[PDB]
Amino acid sequence: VQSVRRQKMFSWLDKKGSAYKEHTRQGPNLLGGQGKDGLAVPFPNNPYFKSQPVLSEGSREIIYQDVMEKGLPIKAVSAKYNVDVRRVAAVIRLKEIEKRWIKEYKPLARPYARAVMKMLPQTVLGGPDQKPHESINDVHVHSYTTQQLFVPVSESREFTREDAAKAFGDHILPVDKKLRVPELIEFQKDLLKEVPLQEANRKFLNATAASEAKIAEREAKRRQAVEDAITRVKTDRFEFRFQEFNAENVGHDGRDRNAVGWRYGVPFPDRKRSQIKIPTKVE
Amino acid sequence: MKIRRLFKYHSLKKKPIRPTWNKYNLYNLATAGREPRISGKTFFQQKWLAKSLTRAYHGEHIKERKWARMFSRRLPAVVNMDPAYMAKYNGSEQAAGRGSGLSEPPAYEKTADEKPAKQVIANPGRKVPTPYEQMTFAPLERRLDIAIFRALFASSARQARQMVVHGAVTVNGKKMKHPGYLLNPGDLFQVDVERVLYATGAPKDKKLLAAAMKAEDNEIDPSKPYMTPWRPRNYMSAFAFIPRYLEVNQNICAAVYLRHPVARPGESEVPSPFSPTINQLAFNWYLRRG
Amino acid sequence: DSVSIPPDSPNYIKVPEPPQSSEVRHPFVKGHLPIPRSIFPKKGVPEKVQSGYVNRIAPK
Amino acid sequence: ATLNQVMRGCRKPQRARHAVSPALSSIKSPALKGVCVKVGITRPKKPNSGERKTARVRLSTGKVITAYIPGEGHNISQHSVVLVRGGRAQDCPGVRYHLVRGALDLAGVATRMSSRSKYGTKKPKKAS
Amino acid sequence: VLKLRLARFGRTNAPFYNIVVAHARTARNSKPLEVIGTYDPVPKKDTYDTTGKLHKDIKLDVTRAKYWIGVGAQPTDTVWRLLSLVGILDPKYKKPQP
Amino acid sequence: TIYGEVTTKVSGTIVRLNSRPPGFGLRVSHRIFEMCRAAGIRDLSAKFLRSRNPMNTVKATYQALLSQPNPEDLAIGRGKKLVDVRKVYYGGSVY
RNA sequence: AUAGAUGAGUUUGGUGAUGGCUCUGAUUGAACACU
RNA sequence: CAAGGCAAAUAGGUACAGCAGUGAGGAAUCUUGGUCAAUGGGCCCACGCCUGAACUGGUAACUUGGAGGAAUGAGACGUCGAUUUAUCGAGUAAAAUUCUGUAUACAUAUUGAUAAUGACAAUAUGUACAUUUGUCUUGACUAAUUACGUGCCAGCAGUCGCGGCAAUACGUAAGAGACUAGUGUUAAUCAUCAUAAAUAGGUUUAAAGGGUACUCAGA
Ligand SMILES: [K+]
Ligand SMILES: [K+]
Ligand SMILES: [Mg+2]
Ligand SMILES: [Mg+2]
Ligand SMILES: [Mg+2]
Ligand SMILES: [Mg+2]
Ligand SMILES: [Mg+2]
Ligand SMILES: [Mg+2]
Ligand SMILES: [Mg+2]
Ligand SMILES: [Mg+2]
Ligand SMILES: [Mg+2]
Ligand SMILES: [Mg+2]
Ligand SMILES: [Mg+2]
Ligand SMILES: [Mg+2]
Ligand SMILES: [Mg+2]
Ligand SMILES: [Mg+2]
Ligand SMILES: [Mg+2]
Ligand SMILES: [Mg+2]
Ligand SMILES: [Mg+2]
Ligand SMILES: [Mg+2]
């Protein structure tokens, strides 16, 4: 015979918790329910954690077509739909893999995809856009900027963000240079000068587009300069890759993090606690 | 070998919260107490209580010794800064007055005034507090097995580890058989389609298929682990939620680890069914493990 | 340039991060390497880098 | 003290504190074997009353110390090779050592069910 | 007798060689005069490469090695071969055609 | 957190409270933790310099939270601004 | 390298001090007992 | 060259703090293996020879890292433990079903190496297998309880302490708390300890101002 605790479980699970057996309605059906900001709360005791929306299937395609077909800069697509550049780049990567599967006649998880998408809040982009997907201007809280500093200055001094950065540290930059899309500030400065919106977007596209070229150029030169130091000597079986480097850059006392060689005077640390012996990155 | 710590995983008497979609766990989570009484208990008794509650869910399959070192006292956070304010103002007004800012009248004088005073100039929503307390178990979200459980690919953390150990996941297009691989920003872990369907799929009852062989759309297949036609687990809708630091693709069962879980001013990106009072106590425990 | 970068690797789309956006704390590396020698003196132009110096100490 | 008085060596090490088990602390040894010289009963002091089962042991080093026999009933007598570990009978002056019960000649309690590790008692093996 | 040779470092079944400039009659792994480069015997495979090719990673300071070779440094058989591939010296052994 | 640093003495019991940055937690003793957790503080680093009397410890640390330096009084006293760099940098007060 | 600084039990009829002892944390080229 | 130990006799060798190993001492620490294939060294015109360094196999939970199984499981309408025979628990626990093929085993291939030489093993792929619990604690410090037995006895104890006939502290039984192929204890070290205080202490009544101040050195 079922115990009372078990009996109460099925009692709650039959009437109050029955609404969670099958997902009939579209959208989140969590326990916490709608909050103050219209976001479902998965755990009632924790109000801060919320079920944030996920880009709908049709939304991912729109982002993909814009970057690939129209060749628009990633920064512009991010600023347009208020999607983080790191997320826009991921959607493209994931979408490319889909094209491979479809190109290789692989079966997709359509039954699983449709079922899971009905349990998560979505944000269809385009015409019917109510709110931005996420914040594209989040700036990392640097450790230096977290300190409590009250600097004594003149009574009539114009303390600016530039002066605040120098008070926190000497090498610190203001929050105007830490943004992932710094062109927005320049775009917003045009609206303060009563510049037509049409021309304001034109300058924005050119600015972002020009910025991507510089990034690509730097990346191109880097990779081209890294392959100039490698000498590939094909042999009967393998291909030897002789990389060059300055053997004199071992610091002033031999101890340097970016040196090349097995260090002398170190016993094998295999016996130390919490010794990482797993791959740290997959290239 | 089932250890003595797993003897009572979903017990209704103890009422623990575990990282799984089991119906027994759902009942415990739903009917969990609103606030455990911690007034009479001492500081150690409060910390020990919080440790047990939080450790029953966060990294339950991780030895206490290992997590003690994994616990980091570095709680990351971000701050939203709109470009509109950046253009107009340069932060000089935030120092006007005596350094802290131009004072404003009290709240009891404003109500009497017919016309409200001009709003203070600052970023939008620049007074809400950021929940640092609810970030203690952030390092556990970097585990390859926990990240799979948060992408709704496995039914629990235990099952998510099985897929990794049995060579079913591939990080950045390469087989990864280590459930402790700490994902890096940009990595792309992809689970096998079949293992995801079985985990999230409904149980395959041989009795329900007995009357199915005689009597878009997917045909019934009696030679597959999950029940055909595939349908979500019985109680998967109560735990269906994806964090903001992941960009999953249901179709190919792949996701990208965009960044590390971060606390914003108003929310947190660490799934935790515990109030800040408990996490705050747990955080104090691991400062000196006492 | 051996093979094109596939969409799986994170280098398929390069998105440079903003300055001072991470605080990774590197661990102290134990051990040292021997300091190579300073062949030339610190002042003046040595005789080893003159017009002909290898034809004077290694004549054919 | 002034900076001059510190150059002259005014900061000397604190006076050493006597250890609990000097015989072991001196040579940094966790235990020592000794031949039992006498098996007797020592009496507690002011608060406590009873009869402790001590034993005069001659360690390998040469020192003759008075150990303590934890448990109910022992199996050692004159000229018994026993293993001595650190410890102290708080209420017994002169007793600053214990004796391992699963030791060479000292046998663990046979009727012990709880905390067998402390008394060197193998598992009963009721079914096995 | 200055010698360009390999100092074996690594764990069991995980050889990792370190190119050094040391006197002949000295311990193999003793602190040398200079560390020209490193050598990895086990061939690797490009991450995203399914053709099946293999390569060996060698970080060598050609400029520094050349100077020592010009003053009478005697590279060993193993190191001589590596220098030959780069083109500094002529091969010490060649496959017979007949 | 509190403003700056405070040091209050109550008959041989001295308590030193420091203001720590956000996300530091209440890395304080058990008695101070109950007071900080109750008053609304979330980041603090205390210390008992001389004595650890349970009662005076509570009296001294309670008297220290009422003796915080007022940045606005110090400004009017010196005729100089005391600008919080954290607020100017982030264009507001990040709570 | 900017997060890193923490206590507890015990002297007195009682209170506040002084001052030791012990526990709380981490560890070993360790030994022993039960496994 | 001298002395003693072993050996030696008319001789005049030997000292394993070279590798493995034996005895002894001790709380306590290993195989009398294979190969010069790799790296290094000595001799050599060259080939080549030698290498107890070295590379490899073996023994030990000594340490670290990893594996050591996930999901479903409600009416076997049973069993057990208590006891308010109907309340409180063992209990989703078990059985059962549905999947996986981890350590490992076997098989193939590649690789450690090339002018040529592979002692031994690593890695990849394929197939196949679901394999133990142990231990401490339970008055406060310090997370976690009752019953019985014993009666300042037997015993527990890191500190304060407990036990003198209704003991939450001893010994059994059950439960509970916790770590886990480890768990405890003993020894030692750092920290705790501003507890020799340079950073950074103190000396009327608590440990501690010299009996005194003229004064060389010295601050
Ligand atoms: K007392
Ligand atoms: K005197
Ligand atoms: Mg005493
Ligand atoms: Mg028991
Ligand atoms: Mg004191
Ligand atoms: Mg008195
Ligand atoms: Mg000898
Ligand atoms: Mg030997
Ligand atoms: Mg012996
Ligand atoms: Mg050789
Ligand atoms: Mg050779
Ligand atoms: Mg030759
Ligand atoms: Mg296998
Ligand atoms: Mg050979
Ligand atoms: Mg308690
Ligand atoms: Mg006991
Ligand atoms: Mg008892
Ligand atoms: Mg282990
Ligand atoms: Mg006097
Ligand atoms: Mg005198």
Q: Across-strand partners of D57?
A: D36, D65
Rounded-to-integer distance, Cα D69 and Cα D65, Å? 13
Three-state secondary structure of chain B: CCCHHHCCCCCCCCCCCCCECCHHHHHHHHCCCCCCCCCCCCHHHHHHHHHHHHHCCCCCCCCHHHHHHHCCCCCCEEECCCHHHHHHCCCCHHHCCCCCCCCCCCHHHHHHCCCCCCCCCCCCCCCCCCCCHHHCCCHHHHEHHHHHHHCCCCCEHHHHHHHHHCCCEEECCEECCCCCCECCCCCEEEECHHHHHHHHECCCCHHHHHCCCCCCCCCCCCCCCCCCCCCECCCCCCCCCCCCCEEEECCCCEEEECCCCCEECCECCCCCCCCHHHHHHHHHHHHHCC
Q: Would the CB atoms of E60 and A268 count as touching at under 8 Å?
A: no
Q: Name the amino acid, one letter, at A258.
A: N
Q: Across-strand partners of E14?
A: E11
Q: How far E56 CA lies from chain A's nearest CA (Å)?
A: 5
Instruction: With beta carbons under 8 A apart, name residues in chain E contacting C3.
Output: 46, 48-49, 51
Substitution target in A100, A227, A262 with the highest count of E β-carbons within 10 Å is A262
Q: Are C15 and A89 in contact (CB under 8 A)?
A: yes
Q: Are A241 and A228 in contact (CB under 8 A)?
A: no
Nearest CA in chain B to A155: B98
Q: Name the amino acid, one letter, at E82.
A: L
CA-based nearest residue to F62, from F37, F41, F32: F32
Dihedral angle of Cα E54, E58, E62, E65, to the nearest 10 degrees: -130
Cα maximum dimension of chain B: 85
Give, in Å, how far the C1' of H40 lies from the CA of E35: 16
Rounded-to-integer distance, Cα A212 and Cα A220, Å? 12
Q: Are B71 and B135 in contact (CB under 8 A)?
A: no
Ligand found nearest the CA of D116: 16
Q: Is the CB of D128 under 7 A from strand H?
A: no
Rounded-to-integer distance, Cα A264 and Cα E9, Å? 10
Three-state secondary structure of E30-96: CCCCEEEEEECCCCECCCCCCCCCCEEEEECCHHHHHHHHHCCCCCCHHHHHHHHHHCCCCCCCCCC
Substitution target in E12, E28, E85 with the highest count of A β-carbons within 10 Å is E85
Q: Are E22 and E49 in contact (CB under 8 A)?
A: no
Q: Name the amino acid, one letter, at A200.
A: A
Rounded-to-integer distance, Cα D98 and Cα A230, Å? 69
Rounded-to-integer distance, Cα B247 and Cα A55, Å? 9
E55-59 and A239-243 as β-strands: parallel, antiparallel, unpaired?
parallel
Residue with tokens 């100089």: F80
Rounded-to-integer distance, Cα B187 and Cα B168, Å? 16
Helix (H) / strand (E) containing F56: helix F54-65
Cα distance between the two ends of chain B: 30
Rounded-to-integer distance, Cα E65 and Cα E94, Å? 23
Backbone angles phi, psi at D34, to 5 degrees: -150, 150
Q: Is the CB of F59 under 7 A from strand G?
A: no
Give, in Å, how far the C1' of G22 lies from the CA of D50: 25
Q: Is F4 exposed, middle or buried (0-12, 13-18, 19+ CB in 10 A)?
A: middle
Q: Across-strand partners of E38?
A: E18, E59
Residue A191 Cα to ligand 10 midpoint, Å, equals 78
Q: Are B245 and B141 in contact (CB under 8 A)?
A: yes
Give the nearest nucleotide to F10, CA to C1'. Answer: G16
Rounded-to-integer distance, Cα E94 and Cα E85, Å? 12
CA-based nearest residue to E68, from E6, E7, E2: E2
Q: Across-strand partners of A230?
A: A243
Q: Would the CB atoms of B173 and C10 count as touching at under 8 Å?
A: no
Dihedral of alpha carbons E49, E51, E53, E54, sign: positive
Residue E76 Cα to ligand 10 midpoint, Å, equals 13
Rounded-to-integer distance, Cα A73 and Cα A201, Å? 13
Q: Are B257 and B1 in contact (CB under 8 A)?
A: no
Which positions 224-263 on chain B have a beta carbon less than 7 angstroms from any atom of strand G? none
Q: In Å, what is the CA distance from A4 to each residue of A8, A25, A97, E69? A: 6, 33, 52, 88
Within 10 angstroms of residue A243's Cβ, the number of other Cβ atoms is 18
D81-86 and A139-140 as β-strands: parallel, antiparallel, unpaired?
unpaired
Note whether C16 contacts B: Cβ–Cβ < 8 A: no
Rg of chain F (C-alpha set): 15
Of F23, F25, F94, the CB nearest to B79: F94
Q: Are F63 and F17 in contact (CB under 8 A)?
A: no
CA-based nearest residue to A92, from E46, C9, B144: C9
Structure tokens at B251: 């179709």
Rounded-to-integer distance, Cα D29 and Cα C9, Å? 57
Of A146, A147, A161, the CB nearest to F88: A161
DSSP assignment string, chain A:
---HHHHHHHHHHHHTSGGGTS--SSS---SSEE-TTS-EESSTT-SS-----B--HHHHHHHHHHHHTS---HHHHHHHHT--HHHHHHHHHHHHHHHHHHHTTPPP-HHHHHHHHTSS-B---SSS--S-SS-S--EE--SGGGS--EEEE-TT----HHHHHHHH-SSPPPTTSS-S-THHHHHHHHHHTT--HHHHHHHHHHHHHHHHHHHHHHHHHHHHHHHHSEEEEE-SS-EEEEE---TT-STTTS--TT--SPPBS---GGGSTT---S-----
Rounded-to-integer distance, Cα B186 and Cα A87, Å? 10
Q: Do chains B and D touch (3 or more CB pairs under 8 A)?
A: no
Within 10 angstroms of residue B289's Cβ, the number of other Cβ atoms is 10
Rounded-to-integer distance, Cα E7 and Cα E33, Å? 13
Rounded-to-integer distance, Cα C28 and Cα C5, Å? 34
Strands in A230-234's sheet, in edge-to-edge order, are: A230-234, A239-243, E55-59, E34-39, E14-23, E2-11
Q: How far A268 CA lies from chain E's nearest CA (Å)?
A: 9
Structure tokens at B287: 């400062």
What residue is closest to H196 (Cα–C1')? D11
CA-based nearest residue to B162, from B153, B174, B173: B153
Instruction: With beta carbons under 8 A apart, name residues in chain F contacting B42.
Output: 30
Residue with tokens 């940094």: D28
Q: Name the amino acid, one letter, at E86.
A: V
Q: Are B289 and B68 in contact (CB under 8 A)?
A: yes
Backbone angles phi, psi at F94, to 5 degrees: -85, 105
Structure tokens at B214: 């005689």
Q: Which residues of B27-38 are buried (b: 16+ CB within 10 A; e: fewer)?
A: bbbbebeeeeeb
Q: Which residues of B120-157 are buried (b: 16+ CB within 10 A; e: fewer)?
A: eebbeebeeebbbbbbbbbbbbbbbbbbbbbbbbbbbb
Helix axes A183-192, A74-81, angle to 10 degrees: 60
Structure tokens at F40: 């609304």
What residue is closest to H187 (Cα–C1')? D30
Rounded-to-integer distance, Cα A167 and Cα B91, Å? 14
CA B7 to chain centre: 25
Q: Would the CB atoms of E31 and C34 count as touching at under 8 Å?
A: yes
D81-86 and D97-99 as β-strands: parallel, antiparallel, unpaired?
antiparallel
With H, G, I as helix, E, B as strand and everything else as coil, classify residue F57: helix
Q: Is B20 exposed, middle or buried (0-12, 13-18, 19+ CB in 10 A)?
A: buried
Ramachandran sector of residue B172 (left: φ over 0; alpha: ψ -120 to 50; beta: rest): left
| Count of alpha carbons within 13 angstroms of residue B68, beta-carbon side | 10
Q: Is the CB of D126 under 7 A from strand H?
A: no
Structure tokens at B73: 């006292």
Of A97, A177, A266, the CB nearest to C30: A266
Q: Would the CB atoms of F21 and A154 count as touching at under 8 Å?
A: no
Rounded-to-integer distance, Cα B123 and Cα B101, Å? 14
Ramachandran sector of residue A251 (left: φ over 0; alpha: ψ -120 to 50; beta: rest): left
Technique behind this structure?
Answer: cryo-EM
Structure tokens at D51: 């009869």
Rounded-to-integer distance, Cα B62 and Cα B51, Å? 14
Residue B290 Cα to ligand 15 midpoint, Å, equals 14
Rounded-to-integer distance, Cα A108 and Cα B252, Å? 6
Nucleotides of G under 7 A from a protein CB: 1-8, 15-18, 20-22, 24-28, 30-35
Q: Would the CB atoms of A86 and B258 count as touching at under 8 Å?
A: yes
Q: Across-strand partners of A152?
A: F82
CA-based nearest residue to E33, from F40, D101, A250, A272: A250
Three-state secondary structure of chain C: CCCCCCCCCHHHCCCCCCCCCCCCCCCCCCCECCCCCCCCCCCCCCHHHCCCCHHHHCCC
Helix axes B43-55, B276-288, angle to 10 degrees: 100
- For this entry, resolution in Å reads 3.1
Q: Is the CB of E44 under 7 A from strand H?
A: no
Rounded-to-integer distance, Cα C21 and Cα A142, Å? 7
Nucleotides of H under 7 A from a protein CB: 25-28, 38-42, 53-57, 63-75, 77-78, 87-94, 97-102, 110-116, 121-122, 124-125, 130-138, 141-144, 152-164, 171-173, 177-181, 183-188, 195-198, 201-202, 218-219
Ramachandran sector of residue B227 (left: φ over 0; alpha: ψ -120 to 50; beta: rest): beta
Rounded-to-integer distance, Cα B200 and Cα B232, Å? 6
Note whether F46 contacts B: Cβ–Cβ < 8 A: no
Give, in Å, how far the C1' of H161 lies from the CA of D90: 11
With H, G, I as helix, E, B as strand and everything else as coil, classify residue D104: coil
Helix axes A85-103, A57-68, angle to 10 degrees: 90
Dihedral angle of Cα A12, A16, A17, A18, to the nearest 10 degrees: 110
Backbone angles phi, psi at B128, to 5 degrees: -75, 145
Q: In Å, what is the CA distance from B74 to each residue of A141, A173, B274? A: 11, 22, 20
Q: Would the CB atoms of A138 and B31 count as touching at under 8 Å?
A: no
Cα maximum dimension of chain A: 81
Within 10 angstroms of residue D14's Cβ, the number of other Cβ atoms is 5
Which positions 79-98 on chain D have a beta carbon less than 7 angstroms from any atom of strand H? 83, 85-92, 98
Q: Across-strand partners of A54?
A: A122
CA-based nearest residue to B238, from F87, A28, A34: A28
Q: Are E41 and E56 in contact (CB under 8 A)?
A: yes
Residue with tokens 């918790």: A17
Rounded-to-integer distance, Cα B143 and Cα B163, Å? 13
Note whether B187 contacts C: Cβ–Cβ < 8 A: yes
Within 10 angstroms of residue B233's Cβ, the number of other Cβ atoms is 20
> In chain F, which among 50-89 make CB contacts under 8 A with chain A?
71, 78-86, 88-89
Rounded-to-integer distance, Cα B110 and Cα B104, Å? 10
Rounded-to-integer distance, Cα B55 and Cα C46, Å? 69
Dihedral angle of Cα A47, A53, A54, A58, to the nearest 10 degrees: 170
Q: Are B120 and B97 in contact (CB under 8 A)?
A: no
CA-based nearest residue to D63, from D23, D25, D18: D23
Question: B211 CB contacts (<8 Å, ≥6 apart)?
Answer: none
CA-based nearest residue to C30, from A256, B235, D2: A256
F44-45 and B246-249 as β-strands: parallel, antiparallel, unpaired?
unpaired
Q: Name the amino acid, one letter, at B165.
A: V
Q: Name the amino acid, one letter, at B70.
A: M
Backbone angles phi, psi at B138, to 5 degrees: -80, -45
Backbone angles phi, psi at A219, to 5 degrees: -60, -40
CA-based nearest residue to A229, from A246, A243, A248: A243
DSSP 8-state symbol, D13:
P
Q: Name the amino acid, one letter, at B65.
A: R
Q: How far A237 CA lies from chain C's nearest CA (Å)?
A: 17
Q: Is A193 exposed, middle or buried (0-12, 13-18, 19+ CB in 10 A)?
A: exposed
Cα maximum dimension of chain F: 44
Residue B43 Cα to ligand 15 midpoint, Å, equals 12
D81-86 and D64-68 as β-strands: parallel, antiparallel, unpaired?
unpaired
Rounded-to-integer distance, Cα A104 and Cα B111, Å? 69
Rounded-to-integer distance, Cα F23 and Cα C23, Å? 15
Where would I find the beta strands (DSSP E) of D6-94? 31-42, 52-59, 64-68, 81-86
Rg of chain A (C-alpha set): 28
DSSP 8-state symbol, D117:
H
Q: Is the CB of A264 under 7 A from strand H?
A: no
Question: F33 CB contacts (<8 Å, ≥6 apart)?
Answer: B43, B284, F26
Rounded-to-integer distance, Cα B165 and Cα A74, Å? 37
| Count of alpha carbons within 13 angstroms of residue D26, beta-carbon side | 6
Q: In Å, what is the CA distance from C31 to each residue of A23, A275, E23? A: 60, 17, 22
Q: Which residues of A3-41 are buried (b: 16+ CB within 10 A; e: fewer)?
A: eeeeeebeeebeeebeebbebeeeebbbbbeeeeeebbb
